[PDB]
Scaffold this active site. Structure first.
Site: not given
Ligand code: HEM
Ligand code: CA
Ligand SMILES: *[C@@H]1O[C@H](CO[C@@H]2O[C@@H](C)[C@@H](O)[C@@H](O)[C@@H]2O)[C@@H](O[C@@H]2O[C@H](CO)[C@@H](O[C@@H]3O[C@H](CO[C@H]4O[C@H](CO)[C@@H](O)[C@H](O)[C@@H]4O[C@@H]4O[C@H](CO)[C@@H](O)[C@H](O)[C@H]4NC(C)=O)[C@@H](O)[C@H](O[C@H]4O[C@H](CO)[C@@H](O)[C@H](O)[C@@H]4O)[C@@H]3O)[C@H](O)[C@H]2NC(C)=O)[C@H](O)[C@H]1NC(C)=O
Ligand SMILES: *[C@@H]1O[C@H](CO[C@@H]2O[C@@H](C)[C@@H](O)[C@@H](O)[C@@H]2O)[C@@H](O[C@@H]2O[C@H](CO)[C@@H](O[C@@H]3O[C@H](CO[C@H]4O[C@H](CO)[C@@H](O)[C@H](O)[C@@H]4O)[C@@H](O)[C@H](O[C@H]4O[C@H](CO)[C@@H](O)[C@H](O)[C@@H]4O)[C@@H]3O)[C@H](O)[C@H]2NC(C)=O)[C@H](O)[C@H]1NC(C)=O
Ligand code: HEM
Ligand SMILES: *[C@@H]1O[C@H](CO)[C@@H](O[C@@H]2O[C@H](CO)[C@@H](O)[C@H](O)[C@H]2NC(C)=O)[C@H](O)[C@H]1NC(C)=O
Ligand SMILES: *[C@@H]1O[C@H](CO)[C@@H](O[C@@H]2O[C@H](CO)[C@@H](O)[C@H](O)[C@H]2NC(C)=O)[C@H](O)[C@H]1NC(C)=O
Ligand code: NAG
Ligand code: NAG
Ligand code: CA
Lengths: 105, 465, 58, 105, 465, 56
Positions: A94-96
């Site tokens: 996701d973070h890529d």
């Molecule tokens: C330890 C694991 C994880 C978190 C702690 C965590 C937390 C977040 C938070 C706080 C957000 C933002 C919420 C908001 O809308 O304000 C968030 C967004 C996104 N996630 Fe989360 N996450 C953890 C774990 C996962 C896993 C396993 C993911 C996918 C398999 C995953 C995805 C995403 C994505 C794509 C977003 C949006 C990112 C963006 O800013 O474009 N996360 N997560």
């Molecule tokens: Ca990338």
């Protein structure tokens, strides 16, 4: 864009030579569907008290979470066919792909 | 005006309001803090509001290297011509590299354990400290970069730092692509969806738009359903490592100190390999560690990550469930009985209709994760469509995709085909026993584990000059 | 703009009596790209951004 | 948007109840393909002297007109199966569909 | 100062002059050009896009306007009869003319100085651009007032707002019918019409009805149809003295000709009884628009074909092969392939001499170059773009005339009888008109009939209690 | 903002003793929507925008 290159740019610029911001950083998401806002163009559903979405009250996100998402954590089911590393690679991947900025403080 | 502390709804704050009978927050004058995503065109009354992606859409390991040029240079070791990424200068993990420390204005990692005073880490992406399991993956890839550069320098002594860095970076990018599309995505989508949305690769198509779709930023949060309430740490016999082998997740958010002071990345990586993921079930969607206590140690109140996901979809103007069903070519339930049929659950359908009134209004995340999962996948058909569509674009529209003619030689492609995530762990940690392929399925020690020496290493001979 | 902790090690390299000239020129260029044009400007920036540069003052 | 109406609004607002600006006046065009600008995001091909498009010099619009569009007007071919009203209705209809503003002097 | 400067500075993008130009011998001169207004001015984040000032719908917004202030200004507010405002100083043999606009820089006044007849006020700002256009605007204004008059007679208790809305809705429906039943089949030809506009089912709220950027350029295919004269004919369809064939460079913004030289009847006859120009690959567009566009009202004659190509560039439109691809049409790479696609090797050579690759051909130039589909006046590229656009305008229009609940069945049956010849009969001094289809009929007397053979629109099913 | 020539006819209607209340009230409301709140404001606007108001 240079006519020959060998490595990716950092920002992703020039990956697509005809439209060189495509996939580059600090650019707007593409939309696969037209956006749906309370005022047509900017305000989220839930902004103005009393304003419905498509004929129905907007549900508090926290309410939905309480009534649908919550469960007693002792009931949790381990997945027999997936490791926790399955979860973790997802977040790392996701973070890529995407980070959506918001204003600070 | 400060969204972190006020419950006033004024731009840019869109605070989540509190229902009566909330199980945690008794006071309805309180709220869950929320900042609206930055608009691409601030202030406009003409444009339709859209949000910004601050990263490269490509699967290019930008979470290692960064997505902006200043940061990419700051991550590099500029004191020699060895092409290395910078490593922490104060601490190491049994003699192996740690991420460098960042310098933030209000550092949330400092607020987890105050006496330890371990700040957040610096990486390609700003979220690298959010959970130590994530930090460990980041740290592993940093080390693999340095390992590759070291080997390439030995193999090609005339190469300068820029060349070494670029060549290693390219290899790391390819490995993230391979792990993602060979090992990970089939277990997300299941075999039917995988064949439908990711048919065998042909070649780069410069007419495939590679951008991230707005809806993906929300749909790929399906992963929140997979999260366990603890972080698990295991020793070199894959036994619980004392005295905190099972830390509640609300005591690991931004807890960078735990990597540095409580045993480095080896315990954490073992725990990921040898512990099961949580199963998403319709009556057990997401755990209270993220629904009740998200970031509770570093903020005034615990957040609700499921609720945030739903607020965020609204902030981004995303259409509801049925619009996305339709987009994906799936039937759109209009009545509670039809919704029941689509979810194989009349009870959940009733609860969703009590909340939303119509399946037209169901928020995309909530709708997506409610669906029963595809055979041998961990999403239902709606999410599989969105996610599979996105990753096809990322592959077919990537001029530097690892299989594209002219990116790597045939011999190099042959070597890269041998890489795997267990091998990368073997190469860069103190761990000598790892998951058998597929790492993402393998979850039980000792049955699913093997010695590192049985795993073949990446052969770089075809990189010689 | 914020000075990063690991960049402290680059100050050491710039002050290493018989470290290689080419190395120091590399680092000077790196800091020039960041608006720091002297080892004065470099250590001053490190200080304002919260670090200890008293170790450099002998 | 009101949940019951009987006539079109003047601006086109609320024709689509879920996304009420679509087809309304003074909104951005929809794009069916990504844009192609010399710099990726704003400058038209032809702006900067010497800058090629996809490997080739940009042709002066007026040169393309001279060499391809021009013909001896008195040799024009009457269309046996179309009236000039066919031309005229087209322009009239165009003026129902799109007007692209430009800055005033 | 893009009107007089040849310096290229935002927002001016002047067309430069090639050596040995046949008309502009001064190579330091230029053709003026202002870049279309950006939706997000000044941004370095957004991809620049342009703005549509009108409703996309086929709703007769060119009669009624697309903005509330203008729409009210177009109405007669001195009674409750639901009428559009009419000129208060001039009539056309006792029938209405459009009111006059009050522009700060009025181009119509420059065409005949002594006459001092300003431009007209209409739903769209371009109503004066050619008197033929003016006449159609005038015709529809009259038809509005006629319908309101009859509805008031039929429903005496209806107020002005009701009358105006009901007449407006009928006019909107008639534009839709003439457009989709009579006009578009002769644009696209039968094959494309069946492909892009299959039989209407029902309103679909997920069909996006916006105008696409590319359509603003592709629909300029019509410039190829333009005759170099305005033709005027008397009540025997003979040339009407003193100026029966006016060069078009003497009719742009020439509002005085409608007011002082015989009103709209001679112009509408000329439209019916003269052929369109045929688009041929060696005869694309005439001198009056290529060499003399608007030469009476500005410092230099413009080149409308060249402007189209500059504008496609200004709007960041992809080239020919990208649009061919989008439409599922083969993309020629070589001169020989382009020769095959255009069925004209000689034109393919000219285009490659200019552009180097068919990837770079500007969309209008490429569109109008293609051989015409059988019984249409565009080739497959333009048929795809135009046909797709109009399908969305129909299927995505909640007020489409055939959509359930917009009109009763009886009203739809009556509307099916309307035609543009009848509209002319009802609102002018013309008593002999084109036989259906008006867009094909072009030769007097062979293709003409008396008005008395045409049935009038019966409004009996609009009667309320 | 620009006064339109056909709106001159509305001034006549507003000054006609025998035009009815409702007719005048509709026109007054129309001109108030444009910032013109009296027959004096209406005539003055017409004058500034280049019309002959000498009949008034
Ligand atoms: C330890 C694991 C994880 C978190 C702690 C965590 C937390 C977040 C938070 C706080 C957000 C933002 C919420 C908001 O809308 O304000 C968030 C967004 C996104 N996630 Fe989360 N996450 C953890 C774990 C996962 C896993 C396993 C993911 C996918 C398999 C995953 C995805 C995403 C994505 C794509 C977003 C949006 C990112 C963006 O800013 O474009 N996360 N997560
Ligand atoms: Ca990338
Ligand atoms: C390189 O990649 C290009 C993009 O491919 C897409 O992405 C990749 C990753 C894969 O997922 C692909 O399957 C996917 O298509 C390819 O170009 C695309 O080719 C297709 C096939 O020729 C084109 O579709 C055609 O589009 C015509 C125009 O109408 C489109 O746009 C309208 C406006 O948005 C929209 O309203 C229409 O619905 C239509 O949208 C397309 O629908 C189809 C059907 O699902 C999809 O496949 C397209 O992706 C849609 N595109 C989007 C996002 O808008 C249509 O006129 C045409 O349909 C008509 O004609 C055919 C003729 O046989 C009939 O079958 C049909 O019934 C109908 O009458 C058809 O849908 C698409 O527009 C192209 N996209 C681009 C960007 O050019 C390349 O072919 C590929 N090259 C190679 C060598 O791999
Ligand atoms: C109401 O109209 C909706 C829109 O209709 C479009 O416009 C009208 C005017 C017509 O021309 C119509 O033909 C147009 O489609 C219509 O909804 C649409 O329905 C189609 C078909 O179900 C949907 O297409 C499917 O799309 C998904 C998602 O990917 C799409 O978007 C991405 C990103 O832009 C593109 O890259 C893709 O190429 C797609 O365009 C695809 O996954 C899916 O393909 C897969 O499944 C099919 C079938 O099994 C296979 O054949 C393929 O190979 C794939 O495996 C389809 O292409 C479309 O997204 C959807 N649009 C909207 C706006 O929702 C709706 O059905 C109409 N309802 C009626 C008339 O009752
Ligand atoms: C008397 C007939 C026509 C013209 C005179 C005329 C002129 C123009 C001009 C000046 C433009 C703008 C040029 C620019 O890019 O600066 C223009 C644009 C458009 N046309 Fe033209 N046009 C005459 C006739 C036709 C016919 C018969 C058309 C179609 C059948 C037609 C179409 C269009 C369209 C759609 C545009 C773009 C409008 C917008 O701003 O979105 N025209 N024309
Ligand atoms: C916060 O950080 C401190 C610093 O590491 C932790 O204290 C250490 O705790 C372990 C076991 O309690 C001992 O081995 C160390 O000797 C302690 N060190 C110091 C400097 O006191 C502390 O445990 C952390 N807090 C929590 C709740 O875990
Ligand atoms: C410009 O307009 C004037 C005024 O309408 C035209 O002069 C009229 O011309 C016709 C025929 O030539 C005569 O019957 C009128 O008596 C003339 N009136 C006046 C006021 O002299 C003149 O013809 C127009 N010029 C052009 C461009 O043709
Ligand atoms: C750069 O590399 C050298 C040699 O490997 C190492 O000792 C040093 O700590 C590195 N510096 C940084 C900041 O990474
Ligand atoms: C309004 O209608 C009346 C009655 O037909 C007419 O005399 C008057 O001129 C009209 N006013 C305008 C401004 O059209
Ligand atoms: Ca319209």
């Amino acid at each position: 864009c240079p006519e020959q290159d060998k490595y990716r740019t950092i920002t992703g610029m020039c990956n697509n030579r005809r439209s060189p911001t495509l996939g580059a950083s600090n650019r707007a998401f593409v939309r696969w569907l037209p956006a749906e806002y309370e005022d047509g163009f900017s305000l989220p559903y839930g902004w103005t008290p009393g304003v419905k979405r498509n004929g129905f009250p907007v549900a508090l996100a926290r309410a939905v979470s309480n009534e649908i998402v919550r469960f007693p954590t002792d009931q949790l089911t381990p997945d027999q066919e997936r490791s926790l590393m399955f979860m973790q690679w997802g977040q790392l991947l996701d973070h890529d792909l995407d980070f959506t900025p918001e204003p600070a403080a | 005006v400060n969204c972190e502390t006020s419950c006033v709804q004024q731009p840019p704050c869109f605070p989540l309001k509190i229902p009566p009978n909330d199980p945690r927050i008794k006071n309805q004058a309180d709220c869950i803090p929320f900042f609206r995503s930055c608009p691409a065109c601030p202030g406009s009354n003409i444009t339709i509001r859209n949000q910004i992606n601050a990263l490269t859409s490509f699967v290019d390991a930008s979470m290692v290297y960064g997505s902006e040029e200043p940061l990419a240079r700051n991550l590099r070791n500029m004191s020699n011509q060895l092409g290395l990424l910078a490593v922490n200068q104060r601490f190491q993990d049994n003699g192996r590299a740690l991420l460098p420390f960042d310098n933030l204005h209000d550092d949330p990692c400092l607020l987890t354990n105050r006496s330890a005073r371990i700040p957040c880490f610096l990486a390609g992406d700003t979220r690298s400290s959010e959970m130590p399991e994530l930090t460990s993956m980041h740290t592993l890839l940093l080390r693999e970069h340095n390992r590759l550069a070291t080997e390439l320098k030995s193999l090609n002594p005339r190469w300068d730092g820029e060349r070494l860095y670029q060549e290693a970076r390219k290899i790391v990018g390819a490995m993230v692509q391979i792990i993602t599309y060979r090992d990970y995505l089939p277990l997300v989508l299941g075999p039917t969806a995988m064949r439908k949305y990711l048919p065998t690769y042909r070649s780069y198509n410069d007419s495939v738009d590679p951008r991230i779709a707005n809806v993906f930023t929300n749909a790929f949060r399906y992963g929140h359903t997979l999260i366990q309430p603890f972080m698990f740490r295991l020793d070199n016999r894959y036994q619980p490592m004392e005295p905190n082998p099972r830390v509640p997740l609300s005591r690991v958010f931004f807890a960078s100190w735990r990597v540095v002071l409580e045993g480095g990345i080896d315990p954490i990586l073992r725990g990921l390999m040898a512990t099961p993921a949580k199963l998403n079930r319709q009556n057990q969607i997401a755990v209270d560690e993220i629904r009740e206590r998200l970031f509770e140690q570093v903020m005034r109140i615990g957040l609700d990550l499921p609720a945030l996901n739903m607020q965020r979809s609204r902030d981004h103007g995303l259409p509801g469930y049925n619009a996305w069903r339709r987009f994906c070519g799936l039937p759109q339930p209009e009545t509670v009985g039809q919704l029941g049929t689509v979810l194989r659950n009349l009870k959940l359908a009733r609860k969703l209709m009590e909340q939303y009134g119509t399946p037209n209004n169901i928020d995309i995340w909530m709708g997506g994760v409610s669906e029963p999962l595809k055979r041998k996948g961990r999403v239902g058909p709606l999410l599989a469509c969105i996610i599979g569509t996105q990753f096809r674009k990322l592959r077919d529209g990537d001029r530097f995709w690892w299989e594209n003619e002219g990116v790597f030689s045939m011999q190099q492609r042959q070597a890269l085909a041998q890489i795997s995530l267990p091998r990368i762990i073997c190469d860069n940690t103190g761990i000598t026993t790892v998951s058998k392929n597929n790492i993402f399925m393998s979850n039980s020690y000792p049955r699913d584990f093997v010695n590192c020496s049985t795993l073949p290493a990446l052969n770089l001979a075809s990189w010689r000059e | 703009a914020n000075f990063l902790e690991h960049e402290l090690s680059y100050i050491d390299v710039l002050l290493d009596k018989n470290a290689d000239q080419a190395t120091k020129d590399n680092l000077r260029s790196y800091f020039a790209d960041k608006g720091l044009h002297s080892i004065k400007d470099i250590i001053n920036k490190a200080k304002q951004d919260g670090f200890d540069v008293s170790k450099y003052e002998h």
